[PDB]
Amino acid sequence: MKGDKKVIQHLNKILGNELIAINQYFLHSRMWNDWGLKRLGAHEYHESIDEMKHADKLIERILFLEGLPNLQDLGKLLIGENTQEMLQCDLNLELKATKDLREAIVHCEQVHDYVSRDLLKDILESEEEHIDYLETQLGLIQKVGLENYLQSHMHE
Amino acid sequence: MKGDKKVIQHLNKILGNELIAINQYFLHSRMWNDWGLKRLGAHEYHESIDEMKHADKLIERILFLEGLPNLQDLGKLLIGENTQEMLQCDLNLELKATKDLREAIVHCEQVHDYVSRDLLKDILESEEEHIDYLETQLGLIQKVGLENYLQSHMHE
Amino acid sequence: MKGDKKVIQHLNKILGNELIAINQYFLHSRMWNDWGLKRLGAHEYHESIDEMKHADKLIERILFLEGLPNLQDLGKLLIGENTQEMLQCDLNLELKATKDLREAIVHCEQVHDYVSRDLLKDILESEEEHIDYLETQLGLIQKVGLENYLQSHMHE
Amino acid sequence: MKGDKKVIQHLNKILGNELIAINQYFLHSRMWNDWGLKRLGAHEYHESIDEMKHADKLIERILFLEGLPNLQDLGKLLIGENTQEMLQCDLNLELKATKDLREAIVHCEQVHDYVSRDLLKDILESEEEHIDYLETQLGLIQKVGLENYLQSHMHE
Amino acid sequence: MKGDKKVIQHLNKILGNELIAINQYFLHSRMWNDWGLKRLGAHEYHESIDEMKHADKLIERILFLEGLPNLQDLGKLLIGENTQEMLQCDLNLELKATKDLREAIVHCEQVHDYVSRDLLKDILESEEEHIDYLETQLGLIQKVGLENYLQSHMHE
Amino acid sequence: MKGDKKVIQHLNKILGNELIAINQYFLHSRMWNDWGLKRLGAHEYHESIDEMKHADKLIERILFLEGLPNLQDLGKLLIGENTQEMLQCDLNLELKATKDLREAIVHCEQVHDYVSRDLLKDILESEEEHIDYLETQLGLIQKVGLENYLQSHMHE
Amino acid sequence: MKGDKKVIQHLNKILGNELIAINQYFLHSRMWNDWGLKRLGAHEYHESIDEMKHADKLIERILFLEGLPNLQDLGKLLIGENTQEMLQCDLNLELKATKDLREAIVHCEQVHDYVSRDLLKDILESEEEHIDYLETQLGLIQKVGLENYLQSHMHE
Ligand code: HEM
Ligand code: HEM
Ligand code: HEM
Ligand code: HEM
Ligand SMILES: O=C1NC(=O)c2c(NCc3cc(F)ccc3O)cccc21
Ligand SMILES: O=C1NC(=O)c2c(NCc3cc(F)ccc3O)cccc21
Ligand SMILES: O=C1NC(=O)c2c(NCc3cc(F)ccc3O)cccc21
Ligand SMILES: [K+]
Ligand SMILES: [K+]
């Protein structure tokens, strides 16, 4: 079913953010596991998988709309080098992600692509949950101290 | 445990091929599903997952060797536009992949990184199984004809 | 709860489309079964049942909003005489139904009937799924040939 | 128990035919598997296994009769280059085998080795079942065409 | 996947050794069973089966590498006339087998056919296990005496 | 089966390293248990058991190759006096063990003792896993602090 | 709990004997397995494990008493060259062990370390059971003859 060209462009822009997220969260996960912070590693792995599921649904919608999913262009990964900075990199990425989702939804609404809108709303819901998670972790580091926060994420 | 620098370079080169494969096989999978060729779609999905598992193990080894896994640089996806060409693109990618695995193993053997060698041998085994699969599919298209081959991959 | 007069008019228009589809899809199903294309017959039966469910929910929403659900004014059924034509007739009907759905959602949004909109969006998602199925089948007739396509739909 | 010398010679002749069939059918099975024709590969594997079981029973009977089972002399394998040739090579072998079985049964009856006869009759029943299968496959190739015939033997 | 010509020649040589072993061990098994030494017969049967499995894997690898598996040429069986001779015949055959496997592994390593090496290494492990069994049996005959050794192998 | 004299010397050297490790890790385990660091005690016990298993397999391989396994010449145990020191003493030992493993594998490869190599490679993989654990613990002492690290290892 | 200095010396002496027995019995076990005398090999393995458990308990007792368990000094292993000698070597070692146990219990009683005495008494009961086993095996070698005795220990 031939879709709106600019909608497909938005979907592909959203897909690009998810593809960045997949790799950034997967790398952070395995960095945390390597450091013995297995609870962070497992959670961040699950964030990676969730972005993979989002990318899948975007790929599928783009193909249905008879566009070409762009998996070739990979934007810049925000890889941190310690726990506090990795969380902030994830958060910075999510704030960019939600901004683009909102702009995409605006355009879907204008051209009446209500099904695409619904898909992007569902993704936006998951990304805001991720932001909640990240904001909470950063807040906890201040409340309990970095050493305790890391201690609490050694074991699953 | 600090690894050999050139070994880590090889591992990262292997990882780059797997990252290309992940996206190429995932896209082909969803293209086939979109076309109603669900048996090809499901198989190619499983090839994608297998490359994901390989990438994971490479990322983990690189981190253990105290290198930096490169998930930023994404080489060129060989995306075909019909079944015969998609299979050939996968095969062309695998023949490149196995060549690089062999060179990587040569160097691991020289510097005595026997554990890395074992990991790359296991990956090489999976990639040669994939080549077998691809060569067989291409051969079947000739034997049964394209229309029958596609018919036989409509339903799972 | 007194609803907007024109919302109810839209809902009754969508209802009218679903009533055509019920009968069109049911007849196509029984024609395919009579021809021994039992897999098409079964799938088309489930398409008819799905439209019956949408009709039910429209009738319920109209009665809640204190309108009169129009089950009396049956529009034109698009019945094919062979499989390719029947699939195309379903597609043609679905493409009108989705245009009317989008127009109804526009109006629901204007007058703030957000629950009616949500219902129409859910129905729209179904109908686009039906369009995906129908386009996929017509593409498969091309890719594998008519004789093979029909063969693959003889047995469930 | 001292058997008749000519009976033992016949049993070794039947054994020799079975040792050819074991290898011919095993190789044909693995060829069909390599080509993706896994239904033929599996069925031919089971034919090879059945010949192994016959060979076992012949070896056991020859030893009971105080003869020396000949596993050293391997006759000519009839290996085909395509499916039609392979099937016809199997059939040519089976027809030689059943001829030899009948001549061996005649001699067992003449010298009153009724147990050896009963063993050979059971093997003969198995070989006639393989001939039925082969003649049926060759006829199916004519009825449905080679492309369809190979299509139907891709999947198990 | 086109393999190295000499690797394939090596694989066919190893296949030739396995084909001798299959028949030699199968005949020894059935001789021991005929003599009432059923524990020896059973164990020797399982050695024959294990060689059959090795031969299968070699055939499959040769065909994947686009060579022709040689099941036609059958080398000399080493058949003993009593238990001690039969065990020593098996041991002589195994010592030739492992010499050939080492030479083939050398060549696989030199041309970087690492998957073929791994296959031959696994077969070599099984053959060294068989050498261990055989040397151990020959030793037990000396320790417990032949009559006791045979007594211990009457009943499974 | 007569093995290479120097292979057996290497195997006995690896064996000697495992015998030190068994005793070193067992004592460390019981020291941690006595101090109430039961999670470290349990984990170190399982490290000791794992070395016992490696020792067993080395002893078995040496006896198969007709050498004399040296369980008599116990080298120097590296016992720490506090947790950080004990972990470092384990790491120091593992780093010598892996160097000796790589030297032994070099020689096994030269004289074509591929089964001994395979055994040593499997042991090497274990030992590198142990190194990963030990480095991770020493890094965690930094990241979370000593008091927190010890606290997290009081209870299993 | 600070223990008596000479109690701790006795416990380390007992521990030293247990450490010898661990290695002597483990090597004897694996020699018997290599020779195909698997029932002896299994029983001797379990004797080695029992000494391992006694060593554990002595190490734990010494640490509780604030001593340093000596796992560094390994006394002379008594290794036989045949079954008869191996059993007698074990028995000679056990007879020195029980001597040293009795002298340690005397001292424990004198200084009122009644819990250490109870531990040593339990270990003495195990060692006297081992002496019973060993004396009985040497008696059986006489009563059934060496060939029969060895025959009865081939199979588990
Ligand atoms: C750095 C690149 C990637 C890595 C390291 C990675 C890793 C993984 C791993 C370890 C799994 C679990 C599979 C299993 O154990 O069964 C997985 C699952 C999955 N991956 Fe990835 N992946 C990567 C990229 C992608 C991409 C780019 C996509 C889609 C475009 C994707 C889609 C999926 C899906 C759909 C699943 C299944 C999740 C489920 O269980 O429902 N992955 N991935
Ligand atoms: C206003 C028009 C119709 C409405 C609102 C309607 C509604 C429904 C509903 C709600 C169901 C149950 C679906 C479920 O499983 O949850 C159903 C079932 C069914 N409908 Fe209709 N339907 C309509 C017309 C028709 C027509 C014209 C036919 C046949 C010509 C038909 C044939 C069937 C059949 C065979 C079933 C399944 C009955 C069973 O349980 O065995 N329907 N319908
Ligand atoms: C003297 C020649 C042979 C004899 C007498 C023989 C006999 C047997 C027997 C009795 C079985 C067990 C069948 C059952 O009861 O299920 C068997 C299994 C088998 N044979 Fe043979 N065989 C021979 C040659 C071969 C050859 C040349 C190959 C392949 C190169 C082969 C491959 C196999 C395989 C793969 C199995 C299945 C083993 C398993 O996984 O359990 N055999 N054979
Ligand atoms: C040559 C030296 C040794 C060898 C070859 C050896 C071998 C083994 C083996 C193979 C096991 C069984 C592992 C399994 O679960 O599969 C074991 C268990 C064990 N070992 Fe050792 N060991 C040695 C020294 C020691 C020492 C010195 C100690 C204590 C100081 C010890 C304490 C233990 C304990 C407590 C167990 C578990 C027993 C149970 O099942 O409760 N080992 N050993
Ligand atoms: O398709 C039809 N949907 C209807 O509601 C309907 C009819 N409704 C009569 C009616 C009027 C009213 F003012 C209040 C209640 C009520 O039932 C009559 C004929 C046909 C249809
Ligand atoms: O396929 C072969 N079948 C055989 O029996 C055989 C051989 N016989 C050894 C033998 C055993 C015996 F119990 C009495 C006499 C005797 O010669 C030698 C090579 C090959 C084969
Ligand atoms: O740690 C030890 N590993 C041993 O093999 C060993 C001993 N072996 C004696 C022996 C010699 C022989 F030529 C044949 C068999 C045999 O058992 C003696 C003392 C200590 C150890
Ligand atoms: K804390
Ligand atoms: K067909």
Swiss-Prot record, chains A, B, C, D, E, F, G:
Stated role: The major iron-storage protein, part of the heterooligomeric bacterioferritin (BFR) complex. The ferroxidase center binds Fe(2+), oxidizes it using dioxygen to Fe(3+), and participates in the subsequent Fe(3+) oxide mineral core formation within the central cavity of the BFR protein shell. Can store up to 600 iron atoms per bacterioferritin protein molecule.
Stated family: Belongs to the bacterioferritin family.
CDD domains tied to this protein: Bacterioferritin
Protein name: Bacterioferritin BfrB
Originating species: Pseudomonas aeruginosa (strain ATCC 15692 / DSM 22644 / CIP 104116 / JCM 14847 / LMG 12228 / 1C / PRS 101 / PAO1)
Location(s), subcellular: Cytoplasm
One of the GO biological process terms: iron ion transport
Enzyme Commission number, as recorded: 1.16.3.1
Binding site for heme b: 52
Result for mutant: residue 68 to A: Assembles into normal BFR with wild-type ability to oxidize Fe(2+) and store Fe(3+), 5.2-fold decrease in rate of iron release from BRF, greatly reduced affinity for Bfd
Binding site for Fe(2+) Fe1: 18, 51, 54, 127
Pfam family, one: Ferritin
Effect of residue 148 to L: About 70% active in Fe(2+) oxidation and storage, diiron-binding site does not coordinate fully, decreased overall flexibility of the BFR, loss of 1 ligand to K(+), reveals more Fe cations bound inside the BFR cavity
Catalyzed chemical reaction(s): 4 Fe(2+) + O2 + 4 H(+) = 4 Fe(3+) + 2 H2O; Fe(2+)(in) = Fe(2+)(out)
GO cellular component: cytosol; ferritin complex
InterPro entries reported in the protein's UniProt record: Bacterioferritin (IPR002024), Ferritin-like (IPR012347), Ferritin-like_diiron (IPR009040), Ferritin-like_SF (IPR009078), Ferritin_DPS_dom (IPR008331)
Domain Ferritin-like diiron: 1-145
